[PDB]
């Protein structure tokens, strides 16, 4: 009910999960998916196969919205952070460009004990 025909795709990948949000050219989201949206529940959500399935499910929902041309934004690191982009390439969506926009601070905040 939107007929967007083009937009962005953000891939947020961590070591616990990978989620994909397909949005429109001025930033508002259209659809999304993740390792928990699909069947997987626990650490299974962080596997590259779950990332592939999440990307494919989000891409098919975007097809339902009528998406053809997609620009890719990537933030984070984890298993399947690349597999998401591979499935997104071979999903039937013409990939416009891939961009890694992983937010990194200029050393402002103190991390948790795990990250030091």
């Amino acid at each position: 009910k939107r007929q967007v025909a083009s937009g962005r795709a953000y891939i947020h990948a961590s070591y616990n999960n990978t989620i994909v949000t397909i949005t429109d050219p001025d930033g508002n989201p259209i659809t999304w998916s993740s390792g928990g949206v699909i069947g997987y529940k626990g650490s299974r959500k962080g596997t590259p196969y779950a990332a592939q399935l999440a990307a494919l499910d989000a891409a098919k929902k975007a097809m339902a919205y009528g998406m053809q041309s997609v620009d890719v934004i990537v933030r984070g690191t984890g298993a399947g952070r690349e597999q998401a982009i591979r499935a997104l390439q071979a999903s039937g969506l013409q990939v416009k460009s891939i961009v890694d926009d992983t937010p990194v601070p200029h050393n402002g905040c103190r991390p948790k004990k795990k990250f030091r």
Binding site: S97, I98, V99, D100
Partner: protein, 70 residues
Amino acid sequence: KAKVKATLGEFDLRDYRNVEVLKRFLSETGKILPRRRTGLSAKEQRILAKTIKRARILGLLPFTEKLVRK
């Protein structure tokens, strides 16, 4: 690979306003290039870093950028 100073003129390392030549010393991202790729001496690099930061605060050089093709 070519180092920045190798392909460049007799330019001012203290001019924070010349974006044309200061852009050469930034990476694909907004990061300042190491001495391995700038071919500068320690003193030259130390001056270039401060001039780059000055240009950044004047909105002439990017504080950070986005990586492509990743």
